[PDB]
Design a protein around this nucleic acid. Structure first.
Ligand SMILES: Nc1ncnc2c1ncn2[C@H]1C[C@H](O)[C@@H](COP(=O)(O)NP(=O)(O)OP(=O)(O)O)O1
Ligand SMILES: [Mn+2]
Ligand SMILES: [Mn+2]
Ligand code: NA
Ligand code: NA
Length: 327
DNA sequence: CCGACGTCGCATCAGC
DNA sequence: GCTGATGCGA
DNA sequence: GTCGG
């Protein structure tokens, strides 16, 4: 499937998805529309009718109708209408700021605050996360080339090892799947002193060192096991300075680490496929553990896992390299 | 017909 | 001030 | 909005 193969349809369904989530606050309709858009995005034929589309899992009667209207007229009346709607289009737009969700966007728009300009001159109505999201609005919508991601990985692994050479850190997500660009950086961290049965300062010392070398520039949230923040590569010579990027760091106990690495490497679809087989095979897999069921359906204790491969073994699937986990 | 549709860590609000 | 709820991003 | 028990 190629981009404008059914691109008009999948663009329409994505726009519908966003208004459901951000304006109508109907999260399940949001996910319904995205599921339809994903299945249609992978359909290897130009759709000729709604009835043709309805055969796909996730496409039902209402979306088939909408496809029929789009195919016949090149538009959807409802979508055209809500686009022109000042209140709804503004609510939907403001949720593009990190930290402004459907509820905050509604409240802002209720009181006349409708644009980034408006947000810019209303700082004291913004919490800390929202101010950062506003400050880096443009940067957070950029993608990260693998080359910068590699440079980012160099800094992270170097500084973590410098704090304590017994730390184990892994950059997961799309990067680990070998993608040529990434939306953010996902770091999983563990340390031999930290297990499930098991200082409450392990994550802090890593964050502090990355701030010290001026890699981490801002903090969205930070607790004992999860850091969410902002980072930036140092500027070259007198060159164009780099965009600020989103980075997460998760501290995970040693015995949960490789379940963590598997899960947070993804992809989405791959995690789903693998989880249901997974079930087929008499095992339950979440981000933390793999557990057996259980002649009744009663989960026994978590099984020992000391590498990704172990999990593949348990469910008798041949190991998949991260490179091959798009689904 | 009608409920499920992942779950959870952290920041902050609502209520006591 | 403490506890539970809500919003948010993932 | 779609699915399925
Ligand atoms: N809904 C989900 N279901 C199962 N696993 C999920 C998940 N969402 C996240 N994951 C676990 C697996 C998701 O792949 C992953 C990392 O989450 P991201 O950073 O949101 N997605 P990625 O890094 O692949 O793409 P990008 O370059 O745009 O950042 O974490
Ligand atoms: Mn990612
Ligand atoms: Mn991420
Ligand atoms: Na269908
Ligand atoms: Na937002």
């Amino acid at each position: 499937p190629q981009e404008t193969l059914n691109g008009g349809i999948t663009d329409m369904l994505t726009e519908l998805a966003n208004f459901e989530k951000n304006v109508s606050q109907a999260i399940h309709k949001y996910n319904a529309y995205r599921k339809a858009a994903s299945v249609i995005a992978k359909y290897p034929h130009k759709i000729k009718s709604g009835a043709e589309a309805k055969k796909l899992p996730g496409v039902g009667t209402k979306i088939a109708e909408k496809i029929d209207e789009f195919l016949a007229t090149g538009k959807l009346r409802k979508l055209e209408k809500i686009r022109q709607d000042d209140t709804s289009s503004s609510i939907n737009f403001l949720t593009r700021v990190s930290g402004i969700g459907p509820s905050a966007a509604r409240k802002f728009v209720d009181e006349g605050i409708k644009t980034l300009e408006d947000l810019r001159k209303n700082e004291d109505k913004l919490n800390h996360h929202q101010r950062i999201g506003l400050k880096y609005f443009g940067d957070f919508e950029k993608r990260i080339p693998r080359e910068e991601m590699l440079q980012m990985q160099d800094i992270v692994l170097n500084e973590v090892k410098k704090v304590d050479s017994e730390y184990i850190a892994t950059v997961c997500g799309s990067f680990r799947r070998g993608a040529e660009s990434s939306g953010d950086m996902d770091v999983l961290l563990t340390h031999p002193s930290f297990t499930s049965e098991s200082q409450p300062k392990l994550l802090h010392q890593v964050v502090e060192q990355l701030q010290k070398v001026h890699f981490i520039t801002d903090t969205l949230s930070k607790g004992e096991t999860k850091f969410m923040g902002v980072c930036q590569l140092p500027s070259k010579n007198d060159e164009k300075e780099y965009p600020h990027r989103r980075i997460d760091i998760r501290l995970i106990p040693k015995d949960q680490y490789y379940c963590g690495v598997l899960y947070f490497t993804g992809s989405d679809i791959f995690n789903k496929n693998m989880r249901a087989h997974a079930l087929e095979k008499g095992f339950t897999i979440n981000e933390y553990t793999i557990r057996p069921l259980g002649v009744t359906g009663v989960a026994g204790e978590p099984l020992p896992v000391d590498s990704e491969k172990d999990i593949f073994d348990y469910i008798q699937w041949k190991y998949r390299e991260p490179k091959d986990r798009s689904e």
